[PDB]
């Protein structure tokens, strides 16, 4: 029944240092037994929920010594030694002193990694695709760091203002880096309008704004 | 140690009833506490409830009204069933145990967890096609290829590549709601360049909400 908040959406830390993810209760967890009935908990990329600290001050079975909880009362913090990139996912602080088990918001933990431009890819429609009366054209950007980039489409050197979405990866808990996908589609008929499709991609780790296109 | 598993329906129609089934290996629910929580989609987790070993029920006073856990001990299952649904209970679904007493313990062990999608929609079942490598999608001597996995619903879909022989280099990108209001993804993978000579890239793709299973090969092209 407890408010569990953790006000951080992302906790970005260097390779190697002590991490800390804060957490916060309205109501103290501590018990007069002398327990505290905190928990934190890590999902990671793809993965369920994994117990790593129960009552405060246990670590859960296969959970490295490098996490440790301090805090009393209202207020915690989630301690991470020697942080390595495969600590990368999102931390949730938990209590069951009062049911319902309450969960705080989570934070993700992210590495900041040396700034890696994208490797820009781009697959024109299939033939199937096309078949069918839609002609999708996919551009990737592969394994960088930061997150932030900007992929516009231009056909015909005219930038195209919609009719396209993005996806990205979570970072990837081995190279730290993230990949994205921007999808443009369109009818065949306004496919077969135009000439050249091109992604142009702006990012970090790029002096300039990169290009790749193909002829129809 | 123990394994949970969910299943049931990945899509139910606002107004039904959702019914889950955990069922659980390497444990007895005859013994300690059984839970339900749910992880909605912007990531935020709500506990449901549990199921003791003595068969009472506890549940989330916000969710009260609307819940049921029961339990069969001769299948070693335990089931949820949530009344009245809305795409406000659109979420993926866990159960997890609690190992230990009123004084100590821990929910300990989840389930890999299963969606659940409220909508009043059909299933679709997504077309598969090949994103083929060419210089286009390579840089020196590697290439990315891929499979478009496009227009079903819902989630989730299942991707891997030659029967899971492939993992290296491989980004399944999540899914991506269209304005069709149907989902997208691709997954691609990179792979040396001279190897697109004499080795075959197959995407195997599986919906099970609409019976599609699709194995696609995926060729070079100029
Ligand atoms: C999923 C089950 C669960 O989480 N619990 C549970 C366990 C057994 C039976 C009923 C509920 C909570 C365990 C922790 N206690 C802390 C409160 C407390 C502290 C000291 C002495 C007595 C009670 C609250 C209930």
């Known amino acids: 029944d407890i408010v569990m908040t953790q006000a951080a959406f992302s906790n970005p830390v260097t390779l190697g240092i002590s991490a800390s993810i804060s957490c916060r209760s309205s109501?103290?967890?501590?018990?007069?037994?002398?327990?505290?009935?905190l928990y934190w908990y890590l999902q990671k990329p793809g993965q369920s929920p994994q117990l790593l600290i129960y009552?405060?001050?246990n670590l859960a079975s296969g959970v490295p010594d490098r996490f440790s909880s301090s805090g009393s009362g209202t207020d915690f913090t989630l301690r991470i030694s020697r942080v390595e990139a495969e600590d990368v996912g999102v931390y949730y602080c938990?209590?069951?002193?009062?049911?319902?088990?309450?969960f705080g918001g989570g934070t993700k933990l992210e590495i900041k990694r040396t700034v890696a431009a994208p490797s820009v890819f781009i697959f024109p429609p299939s033939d199937e695709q096309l078949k069918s009366g839609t002609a999708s054209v996919v551009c990737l950007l592969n394994n960088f760091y930061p997150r932030e980039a900007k992929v516009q489409w231009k056909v015909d050197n005219a930038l195209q203002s919609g009719n396209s979405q993005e996806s990205v990866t979570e970072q990837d808990s081995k190279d730290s880096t993230y990949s994205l996908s921007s999808t443009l589609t369109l009818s065949k008929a306004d496919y077969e309008k135009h000439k050249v499709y091109a992604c142009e991609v702006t990012h970090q780790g790029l002096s300039s704004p990169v290009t790749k296109s193909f002829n129809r | 140690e123990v394994q949970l598993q969910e299943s049931g329906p990945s899509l139910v129609k606002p107004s039904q009833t959702l019914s889950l089934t955990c069922s659980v290996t390497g444990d007895s629910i005859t013994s300690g506490y059984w839970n339900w929580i749910r992880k909605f989609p912007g990531n935020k987790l709500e506990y449901m409830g549990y199921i003791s070993y003595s068969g009472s029920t506890y549940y989330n006073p916000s969710l009260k009204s609307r819940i049921s856990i029961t339990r069969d001990t001769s299948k070693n299952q335990y089931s949820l069933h949530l009344n009245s649904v809305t795409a406000e209970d659109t979420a993926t679904f866990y159960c997890?145990?609690?190992?230990?007493?009123?004084?100590?313990?821990?929910?300990?062990?989840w389930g890999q967890g299963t969606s659940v999608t409220v909508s009043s929609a059909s299933t679709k079942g997504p077309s598969v096609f090949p994103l083929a490598p060419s210089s286009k999608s390579t840089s020196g001597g590697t290439a990315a290829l891929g499979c478009l996995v496009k227009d079903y619903f819902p989630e989730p879909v299942t991707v891997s590549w030659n029967s899971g022989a492939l993992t290296s280099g491989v980004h399944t990108f999540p899914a991506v709601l269209q304005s069709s209001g149907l989902y997208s993804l691709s997954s691609v993978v990179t792979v040396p360049s001279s190897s697109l000579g004499t080795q075959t890239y197959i995407c195997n793709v599986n919906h099970k909400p609409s019976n599609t299973k699709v194995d696609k090969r995926v060729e070079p092209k100029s």
């Open positions: 938990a209590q069951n002193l009062e049911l319902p088990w309450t």
């Open positions: 009552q405060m001050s």
């Open positions: 997890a145990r609690y190992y230990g007493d009123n004084y100590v313990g821990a929910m300990d062990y």
């Open positions: 109501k103290s967890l501590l018990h007069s037994n002398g327990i505290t009935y």
